[PDB]
A paper describes a structure:
[name] (A3G) restricts human immunodeficiency virus type 1 ([name]-1), a finding that prompted extensive studies of APOBEC3 protein restriction of retroviruses and retrotransposons. The APOBEC3 proteins catalyze the deamination of deoxy-cytidine introducing C-to-U modifications in newly synthesized (−)DNA strands of the virus genome, which results in G-to-A mutations in (+)DNA as U is used as a template during (+)DNA strand synthesis. The C-terminal domain (CTD) of these APOBEC3 proteins is catalytically active, containing Zn2+-binding motif HxE-x23–28-C-x2–4-C. The catalytic mechanism of cytosine/cytidine deamination has been studied biochemically and structurally using deaminases from Escherichia coli and yeast. Although all APOBEC3 proteins deaminate cytidines in [name], they show differences in preferred hotspot sequences as 5ʹ-CC for A3G and 5ʹ-TC for other A3s (A3A can deaminate 5ʹ-CC albeit to a lesser extent).
In this study, we present the co-crystal structure of the A3G-CTD and [name] at 1.86 Å resolution. Those lysine substitutions were combined with the other three substitutions, which we previously showed to increase catalytic activity. This variant, hereafter called CTD2, spans residues 191–384 of A3G, and contains P200A, L234K, N236A, C243A, P247K, F310K, Q318K, C321A, Q322A, and C356A substitutions. The catalytically inactive CTD2 (CTD2*) was co-crystallized with the 9nt [name] containing a 5ʹ-TCCCA target sequence (5ʹ-AATCCCAAA). The interface between protein and [name] involves all five nucleotides of the 5′-TCCCA target sequence, and approximately 800 Å2 of surface area on [name] is buried in the interface with CTD2*. Overall, CTD2* recognizes 5ʹ-C−2C−1C0 through hydrogen-bonds formed with their Watson–Crick faces, and T−3 and A+1 by using strong π–π interactions. The most remarkable interaction involving T−3 is the π–π stacking with W211. The C2 carbonyl group forms a hydrogen bond with the mainchain amino proton of D317, the N3 atom forms a hydrogen bond with the mainchain amino proton of Q318K, and the amino group forms a hydrogen bond with the sidechain carboxyl group of D316. The target cytosine (C0) is tightly packed under the Zn2+ ion by stacking aromatic rings with the Zn2+-chelating residue H257 and forming a T-shaped π–π interaction with Y315. Since histidine forms stronger π–π stacking with a purine ring than with a pyrimidine ring, this interaction selects purines in the +1 position rather than pyrimidines, providing an explanation for why 5ʹ-CCCA is the preferential deamination sequence. Loop1 migrates toward loop7 upon [name] binding, with W211 demonstrating the biggest change with its Cα atom moved by 3.9 Å from the position found in the apo-form CTD-2K3A.
Author numbering: 194 to 383
The structure:
DNA sequence: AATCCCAAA
């Protein structure tokens, strides 16, 4: 569908750090090109997707959202001569294995600056922290989604039918708590 | 300390 279901958005992008029940991953993405020394939004290079769930017919092994995203980039046929900025708004941050695959991609495509903005930090059974450091080392800009970024995704990716963004309880405090943990992860303190 | 986990009951 063209726009995300609002209940799906609200459920999946809730940023209570230790909340239960989020066993899917959603990813919104947008692309900019550097032109006349400023980033310009590519209107048709944006969208959203979810993970291919384990046991889904036609993909019984599943496919994480980040991988599904890297899968669409070649079809953009990005000019190998231009600089691009690709921003992903992820409900869960990348697992170790998908962090490594994203790090390989930006190592191989130096004309792409990747920004990952995540609602929640995915622990990956203690393995994600080193994955995120490795992704940052490769040049990705990783941050915790804030109020204005949730609102941006509501306004521009969600099928809101005119309804304004309604922040959930604790959004800012959750964002700030996650930002401290992300900094600790990226500084190798966690 | 552990919480939490692109599910599994
Ligand atoms: Zn993954």
């Amino acid at each position: 569908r063209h726009s995300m279901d609002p209940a799906t958005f609200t459920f999946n992008f809730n940023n209570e750090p230790w909340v239960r029940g989020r066993h899917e991953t959603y990813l919104c993405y947008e692309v900019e090109r550097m032109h006349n020394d400023t980033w310009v939004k590519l209107a048709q290079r944006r969208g959203f997707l979810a993970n291919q769930a384990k046991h889904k017919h036609g993909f019984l092994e599943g496919r994480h959202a980040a991988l599904c995203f890297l899968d669409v980039i070649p079809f953009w046929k990005l000019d190998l001569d231009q600089d691009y900025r690709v921003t992903c708004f992820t409900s869960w941050s990348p697992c170790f294995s998908c962090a490594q695959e994203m790090a390989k991609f930006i190592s191989k495509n130096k004309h792409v600056s990747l920004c990952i903005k995540t609602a929640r930090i995915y622990d990956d059974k203690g393995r994600a922290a080193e994955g995120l450091r490795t992704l940052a080392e490769a040049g990705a800009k990783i941050s915790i989604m804030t109020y204005s970024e949730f609102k941006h995704c509501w306004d521009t990716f969600v099928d809101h039918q005119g309804a304004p963004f309604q922040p959930w309880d604790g959004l800012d405090e959750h964002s700030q708590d996650l930002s401290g943990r992300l900094r600790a992860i990226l500084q190798n303190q966690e």
